[PDB]
Amino acid sequence: MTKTITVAHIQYDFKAVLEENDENDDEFYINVDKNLNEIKEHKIVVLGNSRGVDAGKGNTFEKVGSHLYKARLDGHDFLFNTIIRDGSKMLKRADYTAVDTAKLQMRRFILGTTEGDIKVLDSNFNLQREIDQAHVSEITKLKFFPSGEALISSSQDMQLKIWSVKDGSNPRTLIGHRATVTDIAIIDRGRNVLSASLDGTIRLWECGTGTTIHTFNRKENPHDGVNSIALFVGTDRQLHEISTSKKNNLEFGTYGKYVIAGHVSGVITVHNVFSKEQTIQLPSKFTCSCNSLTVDGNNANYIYAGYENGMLAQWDLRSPECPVGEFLINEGTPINNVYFAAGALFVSSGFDTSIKLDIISDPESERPAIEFETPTFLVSNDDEVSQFCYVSDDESNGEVLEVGKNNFCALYNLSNP
């Protein structure tokens, strides 16, 4: 707050340069953006004889893991995390705009395209089902229900659709949004879902009936479009019911739920899903759109919000008057997506930038703090991340899946040398 996270881009095939093992000197570049738009081109020489690397005086470059490299260049630290698997290998070419995963027994993946197609994939990224023309236009979001046996999609076509994983059937179509549906949150098992839209609404739906039972919006301006939503639990007790009194028609597990909404104006609003009260509004401190936000997975008092100017802010909902951290990433370039997983924040910036930022608890404690001085870049071939998906595999380890345009579907290892 306000400190800037220095972005580096490594030559995508640099690993092949390092393990080439040629007799002669070779070289790869690391471009460091400095407003960004301009840059410093660092040349890392890969000495022949496999006798190592020369990063220049005062600089280092080194392998710290099978798929993890560390550079220090002009006093800035960078980590570079390389692909462990291309998931687009056996897939027909689409521009991916949405992803989710589920694993009850078998692990599965769903992907949504700019063309409106949904693909169901298995553990090995082999196509298991294609739902062609699932929507008229771009799938903006895809979620499995917790059963793993159903899914919900959202689209520019202003509808949401519930699909069966069994047969690709479409038992429900949720209509009523007046603009693009941008986001989805599932309440508990999903008898209720929430959808966000550029029409300014967050609609609470009951799925059995396929109707909207409540519409939330920004109290100051109901037409301020919603880019992102996140659901959190205010308190983790106690249903049926440790207090008086209820209840609300056609609501299932809404009690103690709050929904956070990032707006086109850049404000953020928080709604008690049960009471229907707007509890909080965070100011558009940066005078631009809040494109994406996400809740801290350890402490839901803390949220992370990415804005159209490249500001990443951390807010404490208890103290809504000012952010508790501000971090510029390629100022002037939009943050497209922020996503909390495995004690880290994943951040898509502009057309080319994907960063994993570690979150620690502050020593002078104890409140989560972004490790902004030591970003990790998920190395691609100048590919654009539309969305991240955390894959805890079988047994509490993890990988991150990125999907994007031009058939980008790439897996990254998160665990440590």
Token reading at 293: 């936000």
Q: Which residue has the tokens 């970003």?
A: 375
Distance between CA 130 and CA 117 in Å, rounded?
Answer: 7
Distance between CA 378 and CA 353 in Å, rounded?
Answer: 8
- Are the C-beta atoms of 356 and 345 separated by less than 8 Å? yes
Amino acid at residue number 153 = S
Report the candidate in 365, 370, 247 with the shortest Cα–Cα distance to residue 303: 370
Helix (H, G, I), strand (E, B) or coil at 373: coil
- DSSP conformation letters of 155-209: ETTS-EEEEETTT----EEE---SS-EEEEEEETTTTEEEEEETTS-EEEEETTT
Distance between CA 28 and CA 131 in Å, rounded?
Answer: 42
Number of domains forming the structure of the chain: 1
321 phi/psi in degrees, rounded to 5: -75, -30
Beta-sheet strands, E only, within 217-343: 226-233, 257-263, 268-272, 278-282, 290-295, 302-307, 311-316, 325-328, 335-341
194 phi/psi in degrees, rounded to 5: -120, 140
304 phi/psi in degrees, rounded to 5: -125, 130
Distance between CA 388 and CA 403 in Å, rounded?
Answer: 7
Helix (H, G, I), strand (E, B) or coil at 39: strand
Q: Could you count the other beta carbons within 10 Å of the beta carbon of residue 223?
A: 12
- Are the C-beta atoms of 183 and 196 separated by less than 8 Å? yes
User: C-alpha distances in angstroms, 333 versus 3, 291, 315, 376, 385?
Assistant: 16, 12, 21, 18, 14
| Non-local CB neighbours of 68 within 8 Å, separated by 6+ positions | 79, 80, 81, 82, 376, 413, 416, 417
Cα-Cα end-to-end distance for the chain: 31
**Bond into 247 cis (ω within 30):** yes
Token reading at 127: 């196509």
- Are the C-beta atoms of 129 and 120 separated by less than 8 Å? yes
Token reading at 146: 């917790």
Q: Which residue has the tokens 């058939």?
A: 407
Q: Which structural technique was applied?
A: X-ray
Q: Which domain holds residue 382?
A: 1-417
- Per-residue burial over 2-15, b if 16 or more Cβ lie within 10 Å, else e, is eebbbbbbbbeebb
Token reading at 276: 């229907």
- DSSP conformation letters of 328-368: ESSTTS-EEEEEEETTEEEEEETTTEEEEEEEEE-SS-SSE
Token reading at 117: 């197609």
